Amino acid sequence: PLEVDELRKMDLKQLKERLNELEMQLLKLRVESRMGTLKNTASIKNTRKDIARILTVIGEKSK
């Protein structure tokens, strides 16, 4: 999943938990430190890259 534009579309209140809900499942992927043996290594990069974006898009809304 690569969300790119709808972040700019709608309100900022929801993206807080949208950040949170992503943040939680980041932990879920973070079980790999035990050799989680999770299939999608790129998910972390997918997770890590996108999480910053919404954490960046908020500035465009002059937070």
Partner: protein
């Protein structure tokens, strides 16, 4: 902010033996409460926490739960068991 759920052979007993959790967080070098982090992320009361400074560069904390919250469940919800 919470970063990972450690799963060493040492840890697994603790979540069973004492219903604790081995969680390592940022090295924020300032804490009053790693406590109130969990419940807004897991809805669990806290009974005690402590401080660890591992030589590998992380900051470990033994957090134990009151008996009303069986720590194995949330871990199973997380998904290592």
């Amino acid at each position: 902010i919470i970063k990972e759920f450690l799963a060493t052979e040492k840890a697994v007993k603790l979540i069973e033996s004492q219903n604790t959790l081995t969680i390592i967080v940022n090295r924020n070098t300032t804490k009053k409460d790693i406590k109130n982090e969990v419940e807004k992320l897991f809805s669990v009361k806290v009974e005690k926490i402590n401080t660890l400074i591992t030589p590998k560069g992380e900051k470990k904390a033994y957090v134990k739960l009151k008996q009303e919250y069986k720590a194995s469940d949330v871990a199973h919800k997380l998904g290592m068991l």
